[PDB]
Design an enzyme around this catalytic site. Structure first.
Site, short mmCIF file in Angstrom:
data_model
loop_
_atom_site.label_atom_id
_atom_site.label_comp_id
_atom_site.label_asym_id
_atom_site.label_seq_id
_atom_site.Cartn_x
_atom_site.Cartn_y
_atom_site.Cartn_z
CB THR H 1 -0.88 -0.20 1.16
OG1 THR H 1 -1.77 -1.32 1.59
CG2 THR H 1 -1.72 1.02 1.13
CB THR H 2 2.31 3.67 -1.41
OG1 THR H 2 3.39 2.46 -1.20
CG2 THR H 2 2.58 5.31 -1.94
CB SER H 148 3.51 -1.82 2.90
OG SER H 148 2.66 -1.89 2.17
N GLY H 149 3.93 1.03 2.21
CA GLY H 149 5.24 1.45 0.68
C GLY H 149 6.16 2.67 0.94
CG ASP H 185 5.40 -2.34 -0.26
OD1 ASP H 185 5.98 -3.73 -0.13
OD2 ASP H 185 4.16 -1.82 -0.23
#
Ligand SMILES: CCONC(=O)N1CCC[C@H](C(=O)N[C@@H](C)c2nc(-c3ccc(C#N)cc3)cs2)C1
Lengths: 206, 211, 195, 210, 212, 228, 211, 213, 195
Positions: H1-2, H148-149, H185
């Protein structure tokens, strides 16, 4: 805990040209059942060395046998009495050799360091073998806190043999009256360079 | 999250024929670390009663404030101050009310009763209690209690001296708390000694080893 | 579940034990012979706990003691026998523990009629009176009340009978069959008791 | 415990308190924590007392044997290597956080060895339960260059702070000054009733003369 | 920790921080260890494990260097040159990196450390080898990064990299990378140590600055 | 909260000649990651009361909103300046909140300091309280600095450090604090304590916010970077 | 603990120790274990002291309210039933009580055993506590219905002494009460087991007693 | 995710990827949700929690907008204009963000979502707020990043940011940031969705691009 | 540990149970009255398991059945009594289970002499012979072998005597004291059997 199974405690104090070692007389069982009231926890190594072993009774007996073996070997080989400090360091090394499979014992060494000047010598250890050379008194066992409190309350520097006997005996009896799993009579053992006096106290057998 | 901590310290209590002494250290410490060097443990309930206690400090403070509130409500309603026995049963009921999530506080309730007779009541966490001539609670208690048993009752001594008075008892309690700070790491800093005679409360203070 | 009792006096030493061979929720036997192990030279080793550990440890000690007594052409002292047994039981404590509770008994010219109490942890001590099992709880106090130093054989047998009646009346496992082992007058005898 | 080390002009000063507690109860009120390894190498220990004592004795005797064999001055790096190799072999089960100090041909040298077998050359180090108070005082007052007396005062102040602010540390203050020519040890550097006869009853008594 | 290695037109620059451990146990640790005069290595993970493999690889490299010698004759900044002018007997970076791989792989069950070997050699010129936690070697022909702080500079280094960077711009890039990692990461801090390895001379740089 | 995620680091607070000085760095860490570095960690409760925290940020924000609502509730039921609540009242409220939360095994993962001035004689600031828009020497007995613990344990001292400062700054304070200290002496002492914390604490930063509770109210000094 | 009740020719004897210990440490050798429920019913404490004290006083309150409402004294059976139901209501909460309610009512002399699990056993010879097995051994080996008051009193004292002797967790002082038709009597208000040991088994006092 | 939000001169640009979950369950997911015409929100964490608090906040925003109205008369890309020209009744961004913070904090025992609210209103101009895992709000006056990214682009965004970026360079910065995060990622991928929020109009861009270097 | 036995027929239904009141490792009583819960109207509910659960459940069922029989002024049928008891024991199974093992017995003019076996899980079915406890392992096949449909009261008592002798001989809890119930000839009777 393993120490709660049998209970018991040992104590030692020093005076002027005298030194006392004291212990209780009980073999416990399952932390509450008394099965013997003569299980003496003090052993004589030589004339100037005594050991008071407190902890698990089987480990007490094995450690006493091993120390007797080593002390007798040293004496027959060298043809002389052991210094108390040498036996102290030997006991520390023997305890540490079993670092990860310990004997559950908390010994004390009480003796006379010779030079002839009979100085007192008191040492206490744990199962690992960490010594503490103490100048006034040494304590070990499950009744350690009560014994420490009584000893600092009642200790007086440079007593003769008699006052040392009443002091150490009162300390032991008052400490044992406040422990459930230690008591049933008490041995006191006062060493002097010329003689030795061992007494059994009239204690609370309950 | 374990909701209990031990803040350390010690509280000693002694009685005579017509007086009671209650010493307590004022150290507060979490675990090998000192919060503060003055946190009193003894609290005043009435003009002839005090309560000291050792354990978790928040429980002790809330319990003492609640007991003071209940005694003041008792005075407002029933129009007379309660004896040490009434406050003792009240404290028993209050502690037992939380029987399944107990207060981590061991208490000594000291006072002088209607008959000008010194009374103590030592407590456990869940409210079991009894009268005693001497008592001690806190970290140091296993040290002091053999000393008090030896000096006061004198079971193991063949010849005895039961000649006690206020000054010697104060000196004895001072020696007891001195040994407590000597051999207990959680006992130290200043200590407060409360003395109740028939007239009322008098408070003295004594510095101990800062260590 | 295995009850053992032993009693030492100035001119006797007696042992007693339930003759129950147990397996799961049933009694295999009412005449179990797995507990006592009599040894030449007026010695006896009485065990409780598992039958397998009982057999293995008892035979190990018995054959080692006999090996000593035949190699050296003499009867072993009872104190030496007791401490040999304790050392052997302690050697297996930390590696392969025998769950056996030992009462050693015997006669010796050196130290009279001797009795030693010892547990599965190898914690040993000499005693005038001992017992093992959950029955010990119910009999040991009786042995405190009626024991005196100058007992005779009949008085000791009466004390043991009272202990057996207590074990019948109060104990959860209502044991009723027992085997004795007397040692007096340079003799060894057996008796079976139904109370 | 508060063990502490620092490095001064051609010297290393170690210091420690004198307390040994078996839980809440103080056992020995004047214990000794500064251990002799060699004439030019000393140490102090924190963690399990028995492991500390016996590891220090083993290291001292190994260093003495090496000194007899090679017939040169013992090295600090040798003690560090032996200690780290011994400590990792047990994988952190030898709980010994040891501050080593000494002087050799490579000058003064102070190391902090951690119980899993990692070391670090440092200008000053503190270890034990009261390590953070001593570290605070040291970082406050330590400077790049100082004398023997200034370092002695700083070590005494740090150990005193650990004594007063920590419950697992108390008693007197000991220090040791290790120089190339010789060492100098101060054990007390700072240092901040009778019963009647026959009162105790007895059941039996017997005397035998030795 | 932020360990970084970046190849440029005439050598390889390794870089590291100094912060060891919430409690900063040490703040002057030398993470870049000198295996040999032409070969260095950056460490991350458990310090005891890293020191163990570092001393073992020093021992093995000394043994290899003694083996490599042939019989008979032939033919605050710091800096020094190689005693071995022509690289006649210095061990290869390949050999040291793979024996380190084997050492870390044989003891996967408890070793937890990641290494970045970097140096110069006559055969392959300048090198960079990343040895991972399980002990897997990868040759990074452009750059290698590892440590907790290295996560915060992957895109930064990837964007700023060029093929044949000059010494000055490579130095600025690696310095800014370690500074950004220290700024973003609590576990990395202190002074920056940089080691530049070339055909002839190694040089050591220390920097005592941080971000805004 | 089941445990901390975005955690705030230590706070230091002392009494001095003119009032209270309380200092906190503006860093909030998301594990081992300086996600935020401009976080206001010291809160103004009212003109003579401020709060600081060390622990989870969400719990501290919840407590700050609670005390803010208590402040406007007090201000609504106000006729004279003596009706205002001192730091003792807010400290007791926070202690009771933490104790009640501790009884349910559901605490606010925080250690809180409540500080300020415990009397109205030194100024008429609360004659006309404004919310949306030389100093006097105050006696130490009229000042207040409190501590409240996650278990509800609470107390007062002349100087309180909460969080990682309890081992580092407190020692220095216990050597260097003295009664009737000037602004400059208090500032340099606090700066030294925060410098030591910055050098020997991972979660701390060198971007400091100082708040003064003085006779002329609460004063938020502009934040600054610790030199070296 | 060791509590031991038993019917005989001239009523009931109840006997208790007075020890109280927090694990290994001895807390108090002066605890009052025989609680006066009412004029005729007695109770005795075993296990948890707080629970026993609180619920026996609660039973006393309920008995007093019942006797005032209905104007006739309650029976041992009804008190046992009320206590059993109250204790069973707290099943699964961790209570620890062992109680022996003995007394006299219009049915006669009655004795019941109750515990936290909810038992209501009825008998003529009961014993509870850590040393219950030893007291059972002494009592059953010599109990007889036609004993005089003094004979049964010494039997109870001997049983309690042996229980305190073998058991680590039983001791202090022995208290022996006697219940008759018109009420009850404290025949032994308190007596150290020190003297009991040196009277019963070791009268010579020339050497340490060996078991 | 970003998920990223960056403020620039007279505007704020939010941006997100599309990948959902080792096995990619979905690859066209609208993580940027329209709470109101002047207010958007980027989601991160568990999808169920994010969807439920976001639709609850849409309901609350509808209620607030209905109550904010006064009585009487006064005065492949896609583009929209606000029905409320003067912002007479659109709720403020801070109000919606704070009630979201209270929602996530009250039920933080199991909720595990993190949000970035981005919008515009006449009081505070353009606005960015970040609601963290436990339910703590922080106003990010320059930029906010989560997922997470996002860890792979902290230094990149911090280095490339300026105070008063033009629309073009801000768009290039946020696009390259999400591209780098997707590149580094595994959990983020797919097409890039960008939402540009201004005083008057909202734009919604969709971009398909990869990374080459 | 609590043994229950029951045997049906055409002219009788008999029950039997050990009279042991037990706690920990001791027998409180050899004349326990806590097991049989005879109801008015030729009905019995013999329980095993915990003493407290036995008392609570047995008194609950007995007072509820008496409440029915006094409210409606009639004798409850044994099938109705058995299924009422099963439903009530099942209601507490998931909430706070009584650990009681039920043997219901009785007589009806409708259904004759009835017996129902049921366990702590509330699984019930009528039977010609039933037992509960670990003793049920040892006294089940004896009931199977010697049961026939046309037994008399003396033959059933002999079968129960053989079951008691089996429990003495083989079961480790050497149970010797038992109390019986005999429902026959429109009368309920009690007996006590030793060994
Ligand atoms: C955190 C608290 O610190 N730890 C503490 O305080 N400890 C533990 C160590 C032993 C101490 C102790 O035993 N103190 C004696 C004076 C006491 N006795 C009682 C008591 C209560 C009821 C009865 C009855 N019925 C009998 C005795 C309560 S306290 C109490």
């Amino acid at each position: 805990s393993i120490y709660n199974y049998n209970g018991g405690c040992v104590l030692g104090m020093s005076g002027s040209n005298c030194v006392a070692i004291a212990c209780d007389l009980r073999l416990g069982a399952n932390t509450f059942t008394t099965v013997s009231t003569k299980f003496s926890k003090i052993f004589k190594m030589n004339n100037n060395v005594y050991v008071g072993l407190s902890g698990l009774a089987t480990d007490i007996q094995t450690l006493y046998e091993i120390l007797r073996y080593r002390v007798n070997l040293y004496e027959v080989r060298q043809d002389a009495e052991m210094d108390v400090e040498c036996f102290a360091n030997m006991l520390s090394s023997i305890l540490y050799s079993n670092r990860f499979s310990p004997y559950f014992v908390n010994p004390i060494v009480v003796g006379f360091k010779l030079k002839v000047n009979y100085e007192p010598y008191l040492t206490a250890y744990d199962l690992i073998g960490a010594k503490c050379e103490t100048r006034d008194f040494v304590v070990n066992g499950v009744t350690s806190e009560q014994l420490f409190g009584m000893c600092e309350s009642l200790y007086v520097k440079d007593q003769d043999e008699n006052g040392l006997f009443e002091t150490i005996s009162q300390c032991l009896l008052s400490a044992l009256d406040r422990d459930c799993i230690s008591g049933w009579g008490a041995e006191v053992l006062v060493l002097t360079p010329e003689k030795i006096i061992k007494k059994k106290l009239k204690a609370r057998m309950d | 999250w374990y909701p209990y901590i031990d803040n350390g310290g010690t509280v000693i209590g002694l009685t005579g024929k017509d007086y009671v002494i209650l010493a307590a250290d004022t150290r507060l410490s979490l675990s090998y670390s000192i919060y503060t060097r003055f946190c009193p443990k003894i609290s005043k309930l009435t003009d002839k009663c005090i309560i000291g206690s050792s354990g978790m400090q928040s429980d002790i403070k809330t319990l003492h404030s609640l007991l003071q509130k209940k005694i003041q409500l008792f005075v407002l309603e029933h129009s007379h101050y309660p004896d040490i026995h009434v406050i003792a049963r009240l404290l028993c009921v209050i502690l037992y009310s939380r029987r399944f999530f107990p207060y981590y506080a061991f208490n000594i309730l000291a006072g002088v009763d209607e008959n000008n007779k010194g009374v103590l009541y030592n407590y456990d966490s869940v409210g079991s209690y009894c009268e005693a001539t001497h008592s001690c609670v806190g970290s140091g208690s296993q040290l002091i209690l053999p000393i008090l048993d030896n000096r006061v009752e004198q079971k193991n001594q063949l010849i005895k001296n039961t000649n006690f008075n206020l000054g010697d008892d104060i000196n004895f309690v001072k020696d007891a708390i001195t040994s407590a700070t000597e051999r207990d790491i959680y006992t130290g800093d200043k200590t407060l000694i409360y003395v109740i005679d028939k007239m009322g409360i008098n408070v003295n203070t004594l510095d101990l080893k800062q260590d | 579940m295995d009850t053992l009792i032993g009693l030492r006096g100035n001119n006797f030493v007696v042992l007693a034990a339930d003759t129950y061979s147990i397996n799961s929720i049933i009694k295999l036997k009412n005449d179990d012979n797995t507990k006592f192990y009599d040894i030449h030279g007026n010695k006896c080793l009485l065990l409780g706990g598992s039958i397998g550990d009982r057999l293995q440890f008892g035979e190990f000690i018995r054959k080692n003691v006999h090996l000593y007594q035949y190699q050296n052409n003499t009867d072993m002292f009872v104190k030496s026998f007791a401490f040999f047994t304790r050392k052997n039981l302690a050697y297996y404590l930390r590696r392969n523990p025998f769950e056996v509770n030992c009462l050693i008994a015997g006669y010796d010219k050196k130290d009279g009629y001797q009795l030693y109490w010892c547990d599965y942890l190898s914690n040993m001590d000499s005693v005038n009176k001992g017992a093992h099992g959950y029955g010990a709880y119910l009999v040991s106090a009786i042995l405190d009340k009626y024991y005196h130093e100058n007992l005779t054989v009949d008085e000791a047998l009466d004390i043991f009978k009272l202990c057996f009646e207590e074990l019948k009346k109060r104990f959860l496992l209502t044991q009723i069959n027992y085997e004795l082992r007397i040692m007096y007058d340079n003799k060894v005898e057996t008796q079976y008791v139904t109370v | 415990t508060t063990i502490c080390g620092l490095v001064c002009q051609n010297a290393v000063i170690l210091g420690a308190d004198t307390r040994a507690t078996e839980g809440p109860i103080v056992a020995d009120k004047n214990c000794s924590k500064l251990h002799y390894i060699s004439k030019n190498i000393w140490c102090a220990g924190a963690g399990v007392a028995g492991d500390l004592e016996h590891t220090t004795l083993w290291l001292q005797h190994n260093v003495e044997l090496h000194r007899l064999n090679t017939n040169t001055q013992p090295r600090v790096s040798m003690c560090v290597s032996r200690l780290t190799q011994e400590l990792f072999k047990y994988q952190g089960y030898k709980v010994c956080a040891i501050v080593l100090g000494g002087v050799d041909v490579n000058g003064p040298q102070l190391y902090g060895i951690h119980p899993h077998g990692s070391s670090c050359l440092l200008p000053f180090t503190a270890l034990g339960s009261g390590s953070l108070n001593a570290m605070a005082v040291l970082e406050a007052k330590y400077r790049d260059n100082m004398t023997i007396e200034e370092g002695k005062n700083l070590v005494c102040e740090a150990i005193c702070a650990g004594i007063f602010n920590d419950l697992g540390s108390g008693g007197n203050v000991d220090i040791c000054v290790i120089t190339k020519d010789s060492y100098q040890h101060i054990r007390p550097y700072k240092e901040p009733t009778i019963y009647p006869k026959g009162t105790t009853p007895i059941l039996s008594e017997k005397i035998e003369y030795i | 920790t932020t360990i970084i290695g970046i190849i440029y037109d005439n050598g390889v620059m390794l870089a590291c921080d100094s912060r060891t451990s919430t409690f900063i146990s040490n703040k002057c640790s030398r993470k870049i260890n000198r295996i040999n005069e032409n070969l260095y290595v950056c460490r991350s993970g458990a310090s005891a494990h890293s020191q163990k493999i570092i001393e073992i690889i020093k021992h093995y490299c000394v043994s290899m260097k003694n083996e490599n010698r042939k019989k008979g004759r032939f033919h605050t900044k710091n800096k020094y040159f190689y005693e071995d002018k022509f690289n006649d007997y210095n061990p290869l970076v390949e050999n040291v990196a793979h024996i380190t791989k084997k050492i870390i792989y044989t003891n996967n069950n408890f070793l937890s450390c990641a290494l970045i070997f970097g140096g110069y050699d006559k055969i392959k010129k300048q090198q960079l080898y990343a040895v991972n936690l399980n002990g897997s070697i990868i040759e990074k022909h452009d750059f290698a990064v590892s440590g907790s702080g290295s996560i915060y500079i992957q895109s930064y280094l990837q964007d700023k990299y060029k093929k044949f960077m000059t010494k000055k711009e490579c130095f600025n890039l690696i310095l800014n990378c370690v500074k950004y990692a220290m700024h973003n990461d609590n576990s990395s801090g202190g002074l920056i140590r940089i080691v530049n390895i070339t055909k002839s001379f190694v040089e050591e740089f220390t920097v005592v600055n941080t971000q805004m | 909260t089941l445990g901390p995620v975005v955690t705030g680091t230590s706070v230091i607070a002392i009494k001095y000649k003119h009032g209270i000085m309380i200092a906190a760095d503006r860093k909030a860490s998301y594990g081992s990651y300086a996600k935020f570095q401009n976080v206001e960690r010291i809160f103004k409760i009212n003109n003579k009361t401020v709060m600081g925290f060390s622990g989870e940020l969400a719990d501290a924000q919840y407590l700050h909103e609670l005390l803010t609502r208590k402040n406007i509730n007090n201000l609504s039921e106000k006729k004279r300046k003596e009706d205002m609540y001192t730091p003792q009242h807010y400290h007791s409220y926070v202690s009771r909140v933490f104790y009640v939360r501790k009884n349910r095994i559901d605490p606010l993962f925080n250690n809180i300091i409540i500080a300020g001035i415990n009397s109205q004689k030194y100024d008429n600031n609360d004659d006309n309280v404004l919310l949306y828009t030389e100093y006097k020497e105050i006696h130490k007995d009229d000042l207040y600095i409190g501590f409240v613990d996650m278990h509800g344990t609470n107390f007062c001292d002349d100087y309180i450090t909460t969080g990682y400062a309890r081992y580092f700054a407190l020692t220095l304070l216990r050597d260097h604090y003295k009664d009737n200290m000037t602004e400059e002496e208090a500032r340099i002492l606090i700066n030294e304590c925060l410098r030591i914390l910055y050098f020997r604490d991972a979660t701390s930063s060198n971007f400091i916010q100082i708040v003064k509770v003085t006779s002329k109210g609460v004063e938020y000094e502009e934040p600054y970077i610790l030199p070296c | 603990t060791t509590t031991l009740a038993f019917k005989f020719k001239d009523g009931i004897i109840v006997a208790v120790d007075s020890r109280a210990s927090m694990g290994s440490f001895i807390s108090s050798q002066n605890v009052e274990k025989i609680i006066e429920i009412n004029k005729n019913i007695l109770g005795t404490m075993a296990g948890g002291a707080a629970d026993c004290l609180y619920w026996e006083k609660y039973l006393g309150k309920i008995i007093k309210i019942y006797e005032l409402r209905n104007n006739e004294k309650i029976s041992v059976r009804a008190a046992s039933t009320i206590l059993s139901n109250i204790l069973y209501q707290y099943k699964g909460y961790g209570l620890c009580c062992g109680i022996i309610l003995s007394g006299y009512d219009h049915t006669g002399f009655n004795m019941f055993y109750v515990d936290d699990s909810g038992k209501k056993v009825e008998g003529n010879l009961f014993s509870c506590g850590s040393g219950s097995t030893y007291a059972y051994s002494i009592l059953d080996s010599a109990y007889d219905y036609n004993l005089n008051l003094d004979q049964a009193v010494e039997l109870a004292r001997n049983a309690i002494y042996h229980a305190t002797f073998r058991d680590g967790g039983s001791g202090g002082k022995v208290r022996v009460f006697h219940i008759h038709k018109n009420g009850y009597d404290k025949i032994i208000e308190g007596e150290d087991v020190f003297d009991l040991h040196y009277h019963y088994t070791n009268p010579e006092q020339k050497d340490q007693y060996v078991m």
